[PDB]
Amino acid sequence: EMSLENVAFNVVNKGHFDGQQGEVPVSIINNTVYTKVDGVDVELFENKTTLPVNVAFELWAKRNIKPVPEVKILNNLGVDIAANTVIWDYKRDAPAHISTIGVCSMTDIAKKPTETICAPLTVFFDGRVDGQVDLFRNARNGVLITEGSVKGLQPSVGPKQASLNGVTLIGEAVKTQFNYYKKVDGVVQQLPETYFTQSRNLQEFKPRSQMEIDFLELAMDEFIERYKLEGYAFEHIVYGDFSHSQLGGLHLLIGLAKRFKESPFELEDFIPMDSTVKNYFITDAQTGSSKCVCSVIDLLLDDFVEIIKSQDLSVVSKVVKVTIDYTEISFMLWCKDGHVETFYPK
Amino acid sequence: EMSLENVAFNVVNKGHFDGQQGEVPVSIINNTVYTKVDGVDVELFENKTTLPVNVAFELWAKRNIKPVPEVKILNNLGVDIAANTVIWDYKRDAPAHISTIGVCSMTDIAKKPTETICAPLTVFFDGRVDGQVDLFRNARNGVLITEGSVKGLQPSVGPKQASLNGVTLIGEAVKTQFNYYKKVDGVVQQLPETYFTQSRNLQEFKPRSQMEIDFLELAMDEFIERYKLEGYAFEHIVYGDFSHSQLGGLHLLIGLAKRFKESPFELEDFIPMDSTVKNYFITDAQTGSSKCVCSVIDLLLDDFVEIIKSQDLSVVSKVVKVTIDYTEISFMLWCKDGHVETFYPK
Amino acid sequence: EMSLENVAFNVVNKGHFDGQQGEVPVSIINNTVYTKVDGVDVELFENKTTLPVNVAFELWAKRNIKPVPEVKILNNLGVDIAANTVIWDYKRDAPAHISTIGVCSMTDIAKKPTETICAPLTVFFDGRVDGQVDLFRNARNGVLITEGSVKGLQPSVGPKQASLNGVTLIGEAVKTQFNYYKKVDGVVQQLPETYFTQSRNLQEFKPRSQMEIDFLELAMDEFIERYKLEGYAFEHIVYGDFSHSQLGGLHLLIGLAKRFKESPFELEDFIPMDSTVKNYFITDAQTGSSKCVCSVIDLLLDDFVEIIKSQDLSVVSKVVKVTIDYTEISFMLWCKDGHVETFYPK
Amino acid sequence: EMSLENVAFNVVNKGHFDGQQGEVPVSIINNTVYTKVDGVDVELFENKTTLPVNVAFELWAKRNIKPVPEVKILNNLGVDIAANTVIWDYKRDAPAHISTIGVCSMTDIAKKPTETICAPLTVFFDGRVDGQVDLFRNARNGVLITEGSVKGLQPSVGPKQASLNGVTLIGEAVKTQFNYYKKVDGVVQQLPETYFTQSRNLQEFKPRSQMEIDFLELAMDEFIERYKLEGYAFEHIVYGDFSHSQLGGLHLLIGLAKRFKESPFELEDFIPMDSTVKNYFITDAQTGSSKCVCSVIDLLLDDFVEIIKSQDLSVVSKVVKVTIDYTEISFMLWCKDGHVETFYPK
Amino acid sequence: EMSLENVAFNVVNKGHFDGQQGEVPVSIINNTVYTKVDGVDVELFENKTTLPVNVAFELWAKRNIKPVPEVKILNNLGVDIAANTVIWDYKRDAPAHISTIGVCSMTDIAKKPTETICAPLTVFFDGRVDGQVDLFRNARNGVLITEGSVKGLQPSVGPKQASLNGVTLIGEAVKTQFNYYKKVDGVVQQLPETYFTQSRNLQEFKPRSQMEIDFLELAMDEFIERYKLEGYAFEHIVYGDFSHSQLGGLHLLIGLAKRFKESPFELEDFIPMDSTVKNYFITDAQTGSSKCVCSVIDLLLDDFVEIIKSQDLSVVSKVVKVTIDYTEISFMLWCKDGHVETFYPK
């Protein structure tokens, strides 16, 4: 039975849709789902999507509550749709994908990923659900994730972290490290060697390397000297310049974290979704230095210095392609006389 | 199974809720219920009530599609709630009653009318549904309707017409004449002898007596002379005066019908519900004569002349109580020297 | 006391705001004002305006229920605001003017028209309300209407018809013919001699002259011959051509009425407001002849033939200015060899 | 005068409805009440309830701003309605009860609690308002709270804390400790001896006993040894297990507080209302350990250990009834060989 | 090109409206503007204003992103409208002014401030935009701000802080100190000598003087003794009294900050806009002491003590006018025998 009342029953008694039988009273008002508990209406769900409220409620109740790849990783892999599950985008507070396969009658384009309509679409397959590995094998286009090895397919190790109920974490009691496989037009693709962003947060930033600890603790000159980073414009690219009315650099999240612990500032996420590179409207509350569009990428500082030391500085201006999160990120690089002047993502 | 999808399935395949099993895709947008037919959304229901859209949709799907007493009759009998059915008010486009008994989880105050909560409420019982006569017998307060005789209870013959799917009609293939019984505080009440309104419409007005035919066909003086109605101000009470900027009389629907066939006018029903007496904002398009509040009652012309000839005209001003539609309607009467000056309902 | 509950009380007991004391329960849902009558919510008002629902409800309750100039006349006179009344636009189902003077706290720009803010605005004054003639005398900009003569001011006779509760009518029991006065920058203007549109309707079109009766009754050639209208393209300008996929002519409402009685067609009023000239998307249901933009003006046929016979036909193409409804309407005229080819308003 | 404008005036000039005279401009948009201050609209109220926006605004303005019993206590006492006041549920952001008595015309079922309709309902009476003690005496069903002794009635001492403007606090300048009395069917009931929850918060958790201080400061083994809690599964029931993908225990708020100070986690309150026992969707951000439904009760640690030491551990599995917050809470208890295996509320 | 799609393009690619060419897909749902990024809808804007969603979106995109005077300063100067810019009120999340000049077609009253309609309005002119100084010179009513000196006009130095993207700050990399000029009826006014509020926040309160540091660090008696503040009721006016159920004093934000660092409390801003004096519904969480209306002004403590020491205490009760933020604030002062009893703003 697929019903709004049954979905609300599952949400009330299980926190999510568990497939139980039963129904509860449901009232739908402007864009909100309420249920009656002890004679009063209690809000169950508030629709922040562009879908109808009941459709969005059902998709949210049937979201995957296991660790899943972050939405940015799936986007960079060209995933169009998930097989028999809902990936919830907690940054957008909406389903990650427009259509579903065997989830909701109002959004399903098919009941199984084997149907003809799904063949041109890149379908996401979870190897932790039984049978989906074979579905990926028979799939024309798809991306498979597994927690272990798959016979006949060369794995690609993904990021250490994954999303669990909207919380990005590196699993200890649960496994968040996935092997990734991709098939295009029926043939397996070799996923390129890639860096991965750390998916950290400005407020609760925590270093993940000795170099990051030194960056957060040592002064600018002290840290630059210790890791012999002279000539790579670290004072501008990473630390950030606040002397002018226009903010300079601050293109890595670790620099923003250091400044934020030094002094608060305002970040305006004018495109609130998940991406490898984020653009912010930053206003430095201390000096008044601002930048309408600042590009920030949360690479590990070791990975960033390794990337920036692998580029010859004999070109005055160029665009460098770095494979991060399974996608090619374009960094604009300006150099002067063998030393970096600017290096920022787009 | 009580579900929005099942209710929509019944509406799609049966026109109303028939209790069938099955479900259809449902989308709920601003205040409208849509279903997907051949890949496109088709509007099933538009909520014009103050209830939540899904609740109103379910109550509308479970409305009584048999001939039922008009809403005004039930209101005048003090009915608060119906037993195991929904009376739909088609003039208000809403349920006739706030709560239900065994219909909708969001509106039910009880599952059966025998519960303690229903005892102080006047419950409507339909004798055409099996077992409800005994429920009325055991009921503390209630109004029962039957199509035949009930042993041990003296019947009260109601109006000839009843409402079927919002259409007021005197039944030929179906029975619309009901016997009415009432119990207050556990004791049967004797319903008073009463007149009944005809529930006719201005545009499709059709006479129901020879006197009404004469009124619609004969001129004012000719008709007044034929039925010796001199001295009862029929030229003002019924025919209506349009010589002044303020409209005069026109307090019976038959007079409005005669004028409307003579010349169109505007009626504004500023309280759009069902009542024995209706108040209108009338604008005569021909002369510009208007009245902000005009009281109209649709009595049979024979009944109205019988009522007006039963009142002595020796009182300059008084209020007369006439039992119409099982309720006491107050007519303001002004007389001068033994002849009527004004006689209008309130 | 200015209150939503008091306004609803006045609407319930008087049909409009009469200034009575009292209050009724009010519920405001999505864009609708309901009141509770006998325990059920009855819709009082539905907001079709861009104003807040309560503001629009109060403005609608305080609308002028006397005969007032049609909205198009007030627009052509440059009226910006009314003094101490609300002109309701029944075609738009909205107030005729954005602001008020002494009506609603949420829309008032002033409490009296004598305040400084009202001086640059053209204020509408009604001579039927006591004291407003003197307010017009002291007004810097304004338009005054009276039912009689005003000492020291030369009157301008307006149209015979006026709007009463949204119904356009020529008054018999009430006076709808107004004298118009205008003051700009503190000096009285002489309103030009003007024609007036008839404000008639397609469905209930009724001729108002012997020439119009002949047009509706006589055939095209018979009528053209009778009134010696040869050479003025009446077969195209007025009667309308349906032989091609693009509709021809039909620029006067009387021609549309004749065709409509001959055969129905679709009129799409894509700018649903009141104007001297209306543009329609017309689809002839009989032949399929259509025109995306057809300009229609409802002049009296005698006035139209008088206008068209007063223009020399020696110019191949020109624009003619005709003062209609106190505004200059531009007619595009094309002639060939002394006879009219096309003559349509804009 | 009961008016939306007067209610808004009181909110603007007093923060709540104080009964003052006056009115301010009010605009109602989608579900929000705005007022005009210095020519711009300022939001006064946003409707998060299922009531109409104006009704909810009036009920919110007339909420009780004195210390009142928490909503969970009133629910456990079977309170259906308050006498002449509004209890606001700040967790639901809505009135605690559907109907009122002498508050709002749109929600009142009666004007005084002495009316017949209120007799079957359990009415809440406040002894701090003059005359309500006698109303409780004459009441058939009701719950009375007082700050002092009541002659002829044996008091029941309630919790130390009460809610003041949505803030749970133990009063110092104000009295938050109430004596509770209950009458059912006209006869006074003896409220059972009960424990009370502490109504504390995870983020601002503060210990209220030496045992709680030891729990928050001492390690798990150290604290268990100090209070000889061996054999009662405190390492699982209270501290919480994070070694598996499914979270274990953590059924008391003090354990959640200790973990939260140790490391942050996500709590999803999928039924956001006030209850003695709360169910959460908990995701441990450190280990990834999660539980869809975790039952949490905020008892004082001394009370919890007293309860758990009063149960014989000779039953492998049973349900224990503990009277907390004037209601019987069911704890599922599993024991093995005289020592607790699991003990969690429902 | 002025278009919703172009405005959304500028917001997506620049964070604000920069005047670039291009368009992006836009979807408008209930009160929200979404755009499609990588096939999914991403919320760009949520309308919290009383304007139409697209109008509010365009006004928000064209807001001034340079340091601007705080909204309270502009209100106190009588500013009605800005010349060719949008001042965004971040506290109200709405435009600071109802109309615009050359910004949005739906809100413009003029395209340039030189038009006749703008003459009676006080127009805000920014001297950092080229040509606006001359516009102020030719303006009849206006307020001009400059970063430097203006020939022929005596400057008035404003507050040190200004608003940048909603963040109040004293600029270091950018200039936030403005000279203010005012013209009324075409003649330059001499702005009075004034104090300025500090626009600080309760949570992130930071002292700005040695006296404020002493107040936050020293005890009440110690601080009062150090600055010889005996006899001015500092223990009540500034520190706040929590011994009674009604909160006492606490009329300066520094006292609230000291208490908040001592113990949290609830502030309810029932009129959430920007003013020199703010009214709060304060509930002290520690003692339960509350006050429905508490007036708070964020003056520098040095300025407040200078003001309070400049008033003779020989009057039992009076109203004192202090020019703060270019407006006269009325302080109610009660004294007893030459010492202050109460001194609070209104």
Secondary-structure blueprint:
The structure is cut from a larger assembly and holds 5 copies of chain A (346 residues).
Chain A: H1 4-14, E1 26-29, E2 32-37, E3 40-46, H2 53-61, H3 71-76, E4 81-82, E5 88-89, E6 94-95, E7 100-101, E8 108-110, E9 123-126, H4 132-138, E10 142-146, E11 156-157, E12 161-164, E13 167-170, E14 179-184, E15 187-189, H5 210-217, H6 220-226, H7 234-237, H8 253-262, E16 265-268, E17 277-284, E18 290-297, H9 301-308, E19 317-324, E20 327-336, E21 339-345
Parallel strand pairs in A: 4-9, 7-8, 9-10
Antiparallel strand pairs in A: 1-2, 2-3, 5-6, 10-14, 11-14, 12-13, 14-15, 16-17, 17-18, 19-20, 20-21
Describe it.
Chains A, B, C, D, E: Residues 206-345 form the NendoU domain. Chains A, B, C, D, E: The record marks 295 as: Uracil recognition site. This is part of a larger assembly, with five copies of chain A (346 residues). Chain A folds into three domains: 1-65, no CATH class; 66-191, no CATH class; 192-346, no CATH class. Chain A is globular and about 70 Å long. Helices cover 20% and strands 29% of the residues of chain A. With 346 residues, the first copy, chain A, is an alpha+beta fold. The longest helix of chain A has 11 residues, at 4-14. Chain A contains nine helices and 21 strands. In chain A, 48% of the residues are buried. In chain A, a hairpin with an 8-residue loop joins strand 16 (265-268) and strand 17. Chains in contact: A-B, A-D, A-E, B-C, B-D, C-D, C-E, D-E.
